[PDB]
Amino acid sequence: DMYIERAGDITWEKDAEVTGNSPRLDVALDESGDFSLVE
Amino acid sequence: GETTDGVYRVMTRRLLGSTQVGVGVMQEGVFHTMWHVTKGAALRSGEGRLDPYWGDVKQDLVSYCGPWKLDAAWDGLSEVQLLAVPPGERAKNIQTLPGIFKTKDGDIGAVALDYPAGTSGSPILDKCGRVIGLYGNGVVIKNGSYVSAITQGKRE
């Protein structure tokens, strides 16, 4: 049996850590819901 | 059980200790997560039981107690926040400007942030604190790093 515990509110927090890039990627999505890189 | 809005850890005792398998969002009395996290199994909230209501393995989405409620969309311009919730660690906003999954059916927002698989189901928010989708389905790129879709469902 899986169970859930509350971990926070859903809020935008001003002055959060700002990271990660913004790639444009060619992907396909199969019948099983797995994405893959089209090349 | 607990039906207050907000973000929740999804836990199992079926392995060693208590293991976090994912995350989800309670809203309007409906729990929203990713299919690969629960496999459509029922969940406990203290004494309460949550039974699956809607699911789709292809969208990799599942709702409990009611229909999918989350209908906000990335606007294609603004930065967003991953409210990441990793195993053993406190909830932590992480602000980013999404990239793009280009597919034969359309373009989807993508967030380039790497976290353990137990983080799957963590919500992504716009500047008004509305959930524009969930983190944890995507792809591993040339580097070896992980890029997730902004996965959102349809509200009826």
Ligand SMILES: Nc1cncc2ccccc12
């Ligand atoms: N870093 C990762 C590596 N492999 C699978 C993952 C699935 C969801 C989220 C992050 C992942």
